[PDB]
Coordinates of C-alpha atoms and ligand atoms in Angstrom, one line a residue:
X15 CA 14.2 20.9 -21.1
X16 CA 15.1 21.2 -17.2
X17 CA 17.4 18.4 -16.1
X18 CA 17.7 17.2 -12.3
X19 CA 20.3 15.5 -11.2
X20 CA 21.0 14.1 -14.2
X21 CA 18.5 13.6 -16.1
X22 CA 15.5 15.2 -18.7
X23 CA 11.6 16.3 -17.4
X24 CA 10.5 17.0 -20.6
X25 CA 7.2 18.3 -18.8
X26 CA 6.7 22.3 -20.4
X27 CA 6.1 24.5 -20.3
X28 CA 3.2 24.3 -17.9
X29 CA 5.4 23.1 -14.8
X30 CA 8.5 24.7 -14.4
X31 CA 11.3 25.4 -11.7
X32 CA 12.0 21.3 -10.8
X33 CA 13.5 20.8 -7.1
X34 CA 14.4 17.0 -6.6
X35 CA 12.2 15.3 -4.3
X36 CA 13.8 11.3 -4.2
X37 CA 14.0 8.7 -7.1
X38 CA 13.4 4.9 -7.3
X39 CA 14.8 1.8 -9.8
X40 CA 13.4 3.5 -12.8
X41 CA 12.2 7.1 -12.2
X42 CA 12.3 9.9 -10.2
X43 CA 10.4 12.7 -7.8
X44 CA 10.8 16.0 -8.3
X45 CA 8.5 19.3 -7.3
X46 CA 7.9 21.9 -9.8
X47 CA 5.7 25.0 -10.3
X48 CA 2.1 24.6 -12.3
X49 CA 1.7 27.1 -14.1
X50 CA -2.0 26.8 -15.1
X51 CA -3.0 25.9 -11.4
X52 CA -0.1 28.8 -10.1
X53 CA 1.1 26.0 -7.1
X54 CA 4.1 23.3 -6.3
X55 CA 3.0 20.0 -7.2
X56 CA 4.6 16.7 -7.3
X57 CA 5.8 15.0 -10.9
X58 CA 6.9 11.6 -10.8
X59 CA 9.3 10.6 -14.0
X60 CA 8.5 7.0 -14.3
X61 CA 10.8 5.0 -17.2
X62 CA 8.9 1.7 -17.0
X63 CA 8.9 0.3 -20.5
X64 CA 12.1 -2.0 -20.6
X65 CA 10.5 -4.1 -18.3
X66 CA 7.5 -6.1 -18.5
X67 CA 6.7 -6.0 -14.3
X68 CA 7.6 -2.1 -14.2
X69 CA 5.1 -1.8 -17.3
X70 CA 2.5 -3.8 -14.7
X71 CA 3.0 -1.5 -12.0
X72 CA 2.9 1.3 -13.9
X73 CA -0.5 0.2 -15.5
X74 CA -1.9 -0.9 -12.4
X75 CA -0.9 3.0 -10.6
X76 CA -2.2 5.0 -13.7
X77 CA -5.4 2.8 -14.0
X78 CA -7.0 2.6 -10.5
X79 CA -5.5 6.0 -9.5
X80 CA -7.8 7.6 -12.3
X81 CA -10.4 5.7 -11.5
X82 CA -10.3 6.3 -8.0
X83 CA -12.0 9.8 -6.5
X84 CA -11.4 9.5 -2.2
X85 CA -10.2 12.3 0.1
X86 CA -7.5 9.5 1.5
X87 CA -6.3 8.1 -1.8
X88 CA -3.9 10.4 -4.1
X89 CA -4.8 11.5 -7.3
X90 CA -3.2 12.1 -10.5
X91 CA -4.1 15.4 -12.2
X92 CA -1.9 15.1 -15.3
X93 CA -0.3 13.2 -16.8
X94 CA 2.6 14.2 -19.3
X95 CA 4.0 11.9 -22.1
X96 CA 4.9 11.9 -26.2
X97 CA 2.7 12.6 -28.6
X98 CA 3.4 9.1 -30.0
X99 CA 4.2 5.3 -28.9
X100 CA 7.3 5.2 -30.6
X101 CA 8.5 9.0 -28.8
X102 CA 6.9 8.1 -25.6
X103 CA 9.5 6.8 -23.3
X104 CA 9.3 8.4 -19.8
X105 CA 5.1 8.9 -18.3
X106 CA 5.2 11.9 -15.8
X107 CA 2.6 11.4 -13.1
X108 CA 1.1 14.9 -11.8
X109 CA -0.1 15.1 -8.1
X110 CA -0.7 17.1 -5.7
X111 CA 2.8 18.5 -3.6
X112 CA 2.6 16.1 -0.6
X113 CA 4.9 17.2 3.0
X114 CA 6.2 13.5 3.4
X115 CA 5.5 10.0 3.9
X116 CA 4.8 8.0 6.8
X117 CA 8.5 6.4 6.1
X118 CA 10.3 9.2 6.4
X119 CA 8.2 10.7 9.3
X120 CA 8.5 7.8 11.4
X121 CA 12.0 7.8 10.8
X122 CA 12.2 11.3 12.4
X123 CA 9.4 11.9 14.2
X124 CA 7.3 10.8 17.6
X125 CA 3.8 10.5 17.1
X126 CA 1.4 12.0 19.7
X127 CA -1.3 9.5 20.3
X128 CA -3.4 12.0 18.7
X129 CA -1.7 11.4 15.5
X130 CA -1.2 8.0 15.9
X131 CA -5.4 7.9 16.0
X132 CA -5.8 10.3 12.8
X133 CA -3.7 8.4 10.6
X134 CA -4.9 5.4 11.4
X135 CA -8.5 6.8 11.1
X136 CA -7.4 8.1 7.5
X137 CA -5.5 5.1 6.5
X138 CA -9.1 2.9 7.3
X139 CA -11.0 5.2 5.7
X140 CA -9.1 5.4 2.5
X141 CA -9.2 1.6 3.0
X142 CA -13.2 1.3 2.9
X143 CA -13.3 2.7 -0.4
X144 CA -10.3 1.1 -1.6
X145 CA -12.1 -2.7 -0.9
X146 CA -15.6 -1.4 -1.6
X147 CA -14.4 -1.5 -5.0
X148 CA -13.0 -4.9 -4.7
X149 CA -9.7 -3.6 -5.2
X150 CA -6.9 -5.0 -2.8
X151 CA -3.8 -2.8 -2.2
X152 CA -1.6 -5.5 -1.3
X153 CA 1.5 -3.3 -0.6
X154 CA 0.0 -1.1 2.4
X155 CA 3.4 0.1 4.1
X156 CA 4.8 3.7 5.4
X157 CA 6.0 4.8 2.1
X158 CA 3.1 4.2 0.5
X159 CA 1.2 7.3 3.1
X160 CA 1.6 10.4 1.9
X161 CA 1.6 13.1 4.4
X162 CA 0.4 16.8 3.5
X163 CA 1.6 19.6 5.3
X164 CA -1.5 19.5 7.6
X165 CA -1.5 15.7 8.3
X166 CA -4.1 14.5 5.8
X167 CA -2.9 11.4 4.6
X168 CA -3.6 10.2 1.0
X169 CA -2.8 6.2 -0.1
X170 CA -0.5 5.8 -2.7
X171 CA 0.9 3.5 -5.6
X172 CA -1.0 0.6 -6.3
X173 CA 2.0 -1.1 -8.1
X174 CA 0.6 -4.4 -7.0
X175 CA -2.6 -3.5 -6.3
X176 CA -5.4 -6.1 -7.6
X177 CA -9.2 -7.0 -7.9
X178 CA -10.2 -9.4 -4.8
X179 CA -10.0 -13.3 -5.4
X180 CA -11.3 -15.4 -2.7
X181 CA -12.0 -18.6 -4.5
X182 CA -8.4 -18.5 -6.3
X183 CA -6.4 -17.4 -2.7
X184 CA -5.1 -20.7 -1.7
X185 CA -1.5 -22.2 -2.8
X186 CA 1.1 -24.3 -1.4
X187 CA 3.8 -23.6 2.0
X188 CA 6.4 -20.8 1.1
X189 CA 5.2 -19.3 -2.2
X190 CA 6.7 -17.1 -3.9
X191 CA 5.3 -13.3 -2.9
X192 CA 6.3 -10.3 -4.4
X193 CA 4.4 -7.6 -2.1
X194 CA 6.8 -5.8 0.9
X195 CA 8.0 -8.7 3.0
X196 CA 8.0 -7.0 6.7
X197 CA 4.2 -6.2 5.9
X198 CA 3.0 -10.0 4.6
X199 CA 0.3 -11.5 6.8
X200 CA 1.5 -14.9 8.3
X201 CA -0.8 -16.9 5.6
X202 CA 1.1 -15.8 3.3
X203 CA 4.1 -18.1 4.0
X204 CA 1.6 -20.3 4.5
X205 CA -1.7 -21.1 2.2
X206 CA -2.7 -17.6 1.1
X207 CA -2.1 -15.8 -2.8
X208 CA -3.3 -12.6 -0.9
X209 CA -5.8 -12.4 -2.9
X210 CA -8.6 -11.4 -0.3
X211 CA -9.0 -7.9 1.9
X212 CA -7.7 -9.7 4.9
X213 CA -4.3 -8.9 3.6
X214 CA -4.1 -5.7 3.8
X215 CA -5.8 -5.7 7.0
X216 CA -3.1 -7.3 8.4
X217 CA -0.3 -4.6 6.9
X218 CA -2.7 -1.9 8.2
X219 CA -2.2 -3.5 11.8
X220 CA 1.8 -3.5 10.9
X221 CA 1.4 0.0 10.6
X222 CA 0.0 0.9 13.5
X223 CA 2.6 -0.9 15.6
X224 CA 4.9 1.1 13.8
X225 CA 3.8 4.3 14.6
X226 CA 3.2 3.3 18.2
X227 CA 7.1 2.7 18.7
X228 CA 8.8 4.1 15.3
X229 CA 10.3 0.6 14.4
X230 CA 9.0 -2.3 11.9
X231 CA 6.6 -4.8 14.8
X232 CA 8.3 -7.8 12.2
X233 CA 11.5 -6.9 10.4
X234 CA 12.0 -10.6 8.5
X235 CA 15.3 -10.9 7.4
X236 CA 14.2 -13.5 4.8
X237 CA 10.9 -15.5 3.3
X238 CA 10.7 -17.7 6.0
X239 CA 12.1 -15.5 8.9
X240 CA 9.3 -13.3 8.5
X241 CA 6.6 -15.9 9.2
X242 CA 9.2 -17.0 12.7
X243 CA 8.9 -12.8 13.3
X244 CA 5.5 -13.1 13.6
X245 CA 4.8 -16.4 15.6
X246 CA 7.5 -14.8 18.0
X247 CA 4.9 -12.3 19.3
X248 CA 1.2 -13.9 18.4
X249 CA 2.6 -16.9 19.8
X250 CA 1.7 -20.9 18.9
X251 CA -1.9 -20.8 16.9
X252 CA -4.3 -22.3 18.5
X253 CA -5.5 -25.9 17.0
X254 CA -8.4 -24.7 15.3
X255 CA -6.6 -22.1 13.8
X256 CA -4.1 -24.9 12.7
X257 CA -6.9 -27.0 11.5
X258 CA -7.8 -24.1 9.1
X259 CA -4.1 -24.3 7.4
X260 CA -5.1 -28.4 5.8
X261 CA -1.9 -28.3 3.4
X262 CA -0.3 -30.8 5.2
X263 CA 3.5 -28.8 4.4
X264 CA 2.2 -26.1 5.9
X265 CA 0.4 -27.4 8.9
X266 CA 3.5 -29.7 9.9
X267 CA 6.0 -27.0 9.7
X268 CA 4.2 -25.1 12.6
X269 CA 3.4 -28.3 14.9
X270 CA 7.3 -28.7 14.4
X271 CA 8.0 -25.5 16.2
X272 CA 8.4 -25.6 19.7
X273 CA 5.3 -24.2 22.1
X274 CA 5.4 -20.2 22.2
X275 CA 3.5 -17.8 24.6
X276 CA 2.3 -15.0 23.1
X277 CA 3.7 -11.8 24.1
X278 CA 1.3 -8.8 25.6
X279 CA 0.6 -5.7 23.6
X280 CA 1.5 -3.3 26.0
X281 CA 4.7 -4.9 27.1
X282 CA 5.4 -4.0 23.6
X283 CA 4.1 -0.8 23.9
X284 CA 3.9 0.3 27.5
X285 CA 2.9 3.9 26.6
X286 CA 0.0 3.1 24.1
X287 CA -3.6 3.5 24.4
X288 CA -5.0 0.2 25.4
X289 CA -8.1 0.9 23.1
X290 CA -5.3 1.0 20.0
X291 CA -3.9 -2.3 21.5
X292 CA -7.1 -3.5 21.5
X293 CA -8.0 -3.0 17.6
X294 CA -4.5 -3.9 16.7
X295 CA -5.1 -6.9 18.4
X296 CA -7.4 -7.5 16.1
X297 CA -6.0 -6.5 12.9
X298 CA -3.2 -8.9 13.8
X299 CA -4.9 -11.7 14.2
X300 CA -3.5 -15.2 12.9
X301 CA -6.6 -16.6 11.5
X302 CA -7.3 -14.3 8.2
X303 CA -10.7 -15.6 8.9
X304 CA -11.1 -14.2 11.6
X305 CA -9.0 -11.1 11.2
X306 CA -11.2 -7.8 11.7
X307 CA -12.5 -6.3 8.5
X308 CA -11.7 -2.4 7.8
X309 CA -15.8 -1.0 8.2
X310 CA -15.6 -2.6 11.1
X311 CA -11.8 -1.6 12.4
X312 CA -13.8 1.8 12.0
X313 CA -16.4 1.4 14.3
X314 CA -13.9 0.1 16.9
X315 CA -14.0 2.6 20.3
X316 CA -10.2 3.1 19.4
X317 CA -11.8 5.5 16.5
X318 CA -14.8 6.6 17.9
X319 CA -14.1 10.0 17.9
X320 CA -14.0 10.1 14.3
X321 CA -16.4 7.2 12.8
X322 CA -19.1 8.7 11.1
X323 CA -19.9 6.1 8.3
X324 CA -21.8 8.8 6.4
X325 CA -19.0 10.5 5.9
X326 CA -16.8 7.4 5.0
X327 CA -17.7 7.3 1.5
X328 CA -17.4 3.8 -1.0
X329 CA -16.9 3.4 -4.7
X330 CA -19.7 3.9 -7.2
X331 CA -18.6 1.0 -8.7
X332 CA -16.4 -2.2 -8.3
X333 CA -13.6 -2.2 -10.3
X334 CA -12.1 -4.1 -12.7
X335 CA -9.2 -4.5 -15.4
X336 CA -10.1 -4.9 -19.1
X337 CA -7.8 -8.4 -18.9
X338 CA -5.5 -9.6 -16.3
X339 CA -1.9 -8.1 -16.8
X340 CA -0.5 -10.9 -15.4
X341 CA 0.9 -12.2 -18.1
X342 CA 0.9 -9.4 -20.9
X343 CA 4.8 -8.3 -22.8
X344 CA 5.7 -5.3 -22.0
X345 CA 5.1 -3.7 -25.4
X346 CA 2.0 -4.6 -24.9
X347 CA 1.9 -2.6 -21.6
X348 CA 3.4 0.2 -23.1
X349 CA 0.3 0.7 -25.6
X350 CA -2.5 0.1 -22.6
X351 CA -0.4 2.8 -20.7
X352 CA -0.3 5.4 -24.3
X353 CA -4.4 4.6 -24.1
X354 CA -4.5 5.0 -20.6
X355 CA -3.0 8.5 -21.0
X356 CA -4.3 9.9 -23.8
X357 CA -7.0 11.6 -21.8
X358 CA -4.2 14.4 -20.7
X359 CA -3.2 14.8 -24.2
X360 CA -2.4 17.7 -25.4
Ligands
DKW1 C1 10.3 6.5 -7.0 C2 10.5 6.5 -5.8 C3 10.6 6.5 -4.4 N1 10.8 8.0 -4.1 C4 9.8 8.8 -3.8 O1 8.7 8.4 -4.3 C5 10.2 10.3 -3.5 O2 9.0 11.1 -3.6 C6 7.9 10.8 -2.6 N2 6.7 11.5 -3.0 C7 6.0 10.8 -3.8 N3 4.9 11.4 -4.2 C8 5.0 12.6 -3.6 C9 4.1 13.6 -3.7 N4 3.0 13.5 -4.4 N5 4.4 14.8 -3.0 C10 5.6 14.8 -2.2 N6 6.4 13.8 -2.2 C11 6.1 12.7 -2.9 C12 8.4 9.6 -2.0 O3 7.9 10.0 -0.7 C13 9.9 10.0 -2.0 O4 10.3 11.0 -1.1

């Protein structure tokens, strides 16, 4: 078996000649050569079972990525594991060879507004689909934009990724959130579970101000600082978007703070299109109420050189998971992710 720095991808013989590509807490990217399909493609060595939340995320990636078809969401095309439970302790994910991600090209790279306008177009679009099926990404961020070699951007993950649950979203002030913390929508420090498509609405709008300048719009330091990051640019809310927040914790912590102006868009970003302030403005409203929705972030003018809703296609079908993972051991996990699998065996 090839071995990259320092470790087994036991994934022949059909992929062969492995280049390291980056690694995470419990796996690792590397290229290598297909040789049924005769191109590079990407295999991620993922070593979740030891842990019951790797196990979730692993589940949660594998199951709506297969169930997922969308020109702006990443596919899997194989996946390689044991025969067996009990040899099976590494899953290889199989996708298609991506240039970069929106991380690592923002950390090196000025974006013409040009680009700054297709990703975002591609980023919404791959969003439409991704809530027609009542799915919520909940961890929308750079490194989780793939970038081809041609700028077509694909969604990826999903780690955290759940269905959409309205009438379950509220909870008490400063709840625990697992989801990227520069990225969290105000109401989450507040009131909100994120468990509605305003959420990622909100990281989408992050995103946007981050390719307009290269730099995170809120880099929180902490739980709480992140909400203060926020507030220090949208300013004081407004009372009736105060009188929307009725846990009293939550609602008395932000009368507490002193009164805050809001700071202009393009005094943050002098050299943007005003129509992109405009739509950001939008996407990073306060009130998750009233907080633009991604079909209609499409038809915003910003876009309007690319909206075409017949060519903005939505899931066939909602989605949904056989149970909630929530709470499931990780053995447990292990065998959904063998049965989720077994469709590549072999
Ligand atoms: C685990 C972990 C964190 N590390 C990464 O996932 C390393 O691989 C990236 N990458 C993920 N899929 C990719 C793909 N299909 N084609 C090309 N690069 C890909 C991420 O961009 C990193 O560069």
């Amino acid at each position: 078996p090839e071995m990259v720095r320092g470790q087994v991808f036991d994934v022949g013989p059909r992929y062969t000649n492995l280049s390291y590509i980056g690694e995470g807490a419990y796996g690792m990217v590397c290229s290598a050569y297909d040789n049924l399909n005769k191109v590079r493609v990407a295999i991620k060595k993922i070593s979740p079972f030891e842990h019951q939340t790797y196990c979730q995320r692993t589940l949660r990636e594998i199951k709506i990525l297969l169930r997922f078809r969308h020109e702006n969401i990443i596919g899997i095309n194989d996946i390689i594991r044991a025969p067996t439970i009990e040899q099976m302790k590494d899953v290889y994910i199989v996708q298609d060879l991506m240039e970069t991600d929106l991380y690592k090209l923002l950390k090196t790279q000025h974006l013409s507004n040009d680009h700054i306008c297709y990703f975002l177009y591609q980023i919404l679009r791959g969003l439409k689909y991704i809530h027609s099926a009542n799915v919520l990404h909940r961890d929308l961020k750079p490194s989780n934009l793939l970038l081809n070699t041609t700028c077509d951007l694909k969604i990826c993950d999903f780690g955290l990724a759940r269905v959409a649950d309205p009438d379950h979203d509220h909870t008490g002030f400063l709840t625990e959130y697992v989801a990227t913390r520069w990225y969290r929508a105000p109401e989450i420090m507040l009131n909100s579970k994120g468990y509605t498509k305003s959420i990622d609405i909100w990281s989408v709008g992050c995103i946007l101000a981050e390719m307009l300048s290269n730099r995170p719009i809120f880099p929180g330091k902490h739980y709480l600082d992140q909400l203060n990051h926020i507030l220090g640019i949208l300013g004081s809310p407004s009372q009736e978007d105060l009188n929307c927040i009725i846990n009293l914790k939550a609602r008395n912590y932000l009368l507490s703070l002193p009164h805050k102006n809001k700071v202009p868009w393009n005094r943050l970003f002098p050299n943007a299109d005003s129509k992109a302030l405009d739509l950001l403005d939008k996407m990073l409203t306060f009130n998750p109420h009233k907080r633009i929705e991604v079909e209609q972030a499409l038809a915003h003018p910003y876009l309007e050189q690319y909206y075409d809703p017949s060519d903005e296609p939505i899931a066939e079908a909602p989605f949904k998971f056989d149970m909630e993972l929530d709470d499931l051991p990780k053995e447990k996990l292990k065998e959904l992710i063998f049965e989720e699998t077994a469709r590549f065996q072999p």
